[PDB]
Amino acid sequence: GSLTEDGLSYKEKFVVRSYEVGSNKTATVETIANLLQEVGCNHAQSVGFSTFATTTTMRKLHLIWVTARMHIEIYKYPAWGDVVEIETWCQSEGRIGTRRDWILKDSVTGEVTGRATSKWVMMNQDTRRLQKVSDDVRDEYLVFCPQEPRLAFPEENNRSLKKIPKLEDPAQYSMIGLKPRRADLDMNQHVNNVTYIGWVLESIPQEIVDTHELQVITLDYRRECQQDDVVDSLTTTTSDSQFLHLLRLSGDGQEINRGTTLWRKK
Amino acid sequence: GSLTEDGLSYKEKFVVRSYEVGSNKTATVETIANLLQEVGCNHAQSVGFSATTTTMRKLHLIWVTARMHIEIYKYPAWGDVVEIETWCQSEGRIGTRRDWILKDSVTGEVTGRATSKWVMMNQDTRRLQKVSDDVRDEYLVFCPQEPRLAFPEENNRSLKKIPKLEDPAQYSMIGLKPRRADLDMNQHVNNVTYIGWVLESIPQEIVDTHELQVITLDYRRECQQDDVVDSLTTTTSNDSQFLHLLRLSGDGQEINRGTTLWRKK
Ligand SMILES: CN(C)S(=O)(=O)N1CCOCC1
Numbered sequence: 001g002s003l004t005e006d007g008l009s010y011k012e013k014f015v016v017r018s019y020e021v022g023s024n025k026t027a028t029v030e031t032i033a034n035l036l037q038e039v040g041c042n043h044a045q046s047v048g049f050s051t052f053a054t055t056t057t058m059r060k061l062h063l064i065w066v067t068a069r070m071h072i073e074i075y076k077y078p079a080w081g082d083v084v085e086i087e088t089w090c091q092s093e094g095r096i097g098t099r100r101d102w103i104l105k106d107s108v109t110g111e112v113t114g115r116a117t118s119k120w121v122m123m124n125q126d127t128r129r130l131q132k133v134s135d136d137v138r139d140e141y142l143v144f145c146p147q148e149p150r151l152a153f154p155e156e157n158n159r160s161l162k163k164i165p166k167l168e169d170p171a172q173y174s175m176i177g178l179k180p181r182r183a184d185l186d187m188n189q190h191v192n193n194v195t196y197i198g199w200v201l202e203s204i205p206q207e208i209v210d211t212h213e214l215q216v217i218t219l220d221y222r223r224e225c226q227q228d229d230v231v232d233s234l235t236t237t238t239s240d241s242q243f244l245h246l247l248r249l250s251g252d253g254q255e256i257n258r259g260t261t262l263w264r265k266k
Numbered sequence: 267g268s269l270t271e272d273g274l275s276y277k278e279k280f281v282v283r284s285y286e287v288g289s290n291k292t293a294t295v296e297t298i299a300n301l302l303q304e305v306g307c308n309h310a311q312s313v314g315f316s317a318t319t320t321t322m323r324k325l326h327l328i329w330v331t332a333r334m335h336i337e338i339y340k341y342p343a344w345g346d347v348v349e350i351e352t353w354c355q356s357e358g359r360i361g362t363r364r365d366w367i368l369k370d371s372v373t374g375e376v377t378g379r380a381t382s383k384w385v386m387m388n389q390d391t392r393r394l395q396k397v398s399d400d401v402r403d404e405y406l407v408f409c410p411q412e413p414r415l416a417f418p419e420e421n422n423r424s425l426k427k428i429p430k431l432e433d434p435a436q437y438s439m440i441g442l443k444p445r446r447a448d449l450d451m452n453q454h455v456n457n458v459t460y461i462g463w464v465l466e467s468i469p470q471e472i473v474d475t476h477e478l479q480v481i482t483l484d485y486r487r488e489c490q491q492d493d494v495v496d497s498l499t500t501t502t503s504n505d506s507q508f509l510h511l512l513r514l515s516g517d518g519q520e521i522n523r524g525t526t527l528w529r530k531k
């Protein structure tokens with residue numbers, strides 16, 4: 001890992017591991033999600049913003065960054081043993097939050113094999129509840145960001161900004177009774193964001209996963225799943241195959257996540 | 267990763283990832299288990315395998331884990347480089363062994379060690395079997411000839427018989443199921459999943475105030491994709507010892523049994 005020449009982005013190479021791949025000997029979308037999160041964490045560390053990726057006024061008001069939206073598009077999943085180079089950068093979205101974008105490339109050819117975008121909001125670190133975003137904690141990190149607009153999804157009306165509807169009962173498919181284990185928690189005993197992607201895909205029938213490849217995943221994070229919570233994952237086909245997804249707590253039916261996935265025949 | 271000079275062992279360096287660590291900002295025992303499995307995989311690849319010999323493919327025979335023993339003196343911190351050395355040894359008709367030594371890359375100090383017992387099984391019938399002399403000669407050329415042991419000790423805890431837990435268990439985690447992330451490239455539950463499931467019945471107060479030093483785990487049967495497992499634990503003991511039992515909900519069929527040793531932070 002190393003910051004690029006202008007110090008406005010970070011790049012890192014990963015060799016795909018035997019246990020990180022699926023039945024097609026290529027990296028799963030959850031492995032990709034963890035690789036995106038790891039290169040995000042090393043970019044914050046390399047510029048002096050790690051203690052959580054936080055700024056000086058955030059540390060004082062006790063605010064942390066939390067994911068509100070994750071959008072990934074994969075054109076080619078890396079094979080077991082292949083080297084994948086990822087480039088990451090951040091940009092402010094005014095006083096509404098921040099964005100982190102990624103570009104995945106094949107190290108051998110330099111060809112783009114995927115791309116991601118994420119929306120981040122402020123949250124009180126002690127209570128774990130959402131709080132406003134002010135310009136007080138804005139100028140302190142914008143010098144480590146590209147100045148002109150730079151997006152992984154620049155195109156007008158692109159899939160990453162599409163409004164997601166809420167799934168109406170009954171769901172076509174479901175996986176009920178999902179619970180997090182210690183391996184699903186992060187260093188601060190909180191459920192890893194990549195877990196929710198896995199839980200979302202659990203309600204997709206195996207026949208689909210065996211005959212199709214996942215091209216697009218958009219996921220909105222409404223509420224976090226606590227260590228002792230139990231989640232149901234619901235899916236209904238809306239179509240290439242398209243699915244509408246809903247993660248909710250088993251007891252009260254409180255929404256934790258909503259999303260959409262797009263799959264293509266192999 | 268690279269085979270050592272005599273081509274009788276393999277070494278690899280791993281940089282610890284942000285998502286691979288626990289509450290102490292050090293690698294979890296499951297992360298270590300996956301690192302052991304990955305360096306095992308690359309050692310088999312570097313010598314010609316894709317760990318099945320030519321004669322084993324014809325007879326529909328695979329290697330399966332029967333025991334896993336890990337001792338950790340120091341878990342690597344997030345960002346640290348951990349060097350692992352792995353090798354294999356024959357166990358005659360019984361099966362094979364794969365050992366590991368974990369070291370700090372900066373000091374060369376041993377921070378942990380592991381051992382594993384492997385047995386031959388027919389893929390179709392699931393029935394375990396003794397190693398024939400034809401198969402034995404194929405892999406014996408890749409093992410050190412003067413046996414190398416990770417656990418040399420005359421009465422090492424890696425060879426101790428593990429009893430079966432009697433109901434009622436002191437503690438339990440009920441209704442554990444595998445998700446797709448828990449499966450390997452052949453749609454089978456990863457061996458590291460069972461370690462995680464075993465540790466789920468350990469109370470959080472113990473995990474927060476103690477560090478895991480030793481884990482021995484016997485693999486009796488495998489959990490299929492649609493199975494549901496219960497994890498049982500009873501304290502048997504500064505140092506804490508636990509007896510573990512993983513079993514299916516549907517009938518109470520044993521899949522794993524084990525022991526863990528923890529020490530106050
Ligand atoms: C500038 N960094 C690399 S950052 O994107 O990680 N981050 C921006 C805002 O939050 C604090 C740090």
Ligand SMILES: CN(C)S(=O)(=O)N1CCOCC1
Binds near residue numbers: 309310311315353
């Ligand atoms: C020689 N390899 C690295 S090995 O240890 O994977 N090997 C021994 C067991 O049977 C065949 C495969």
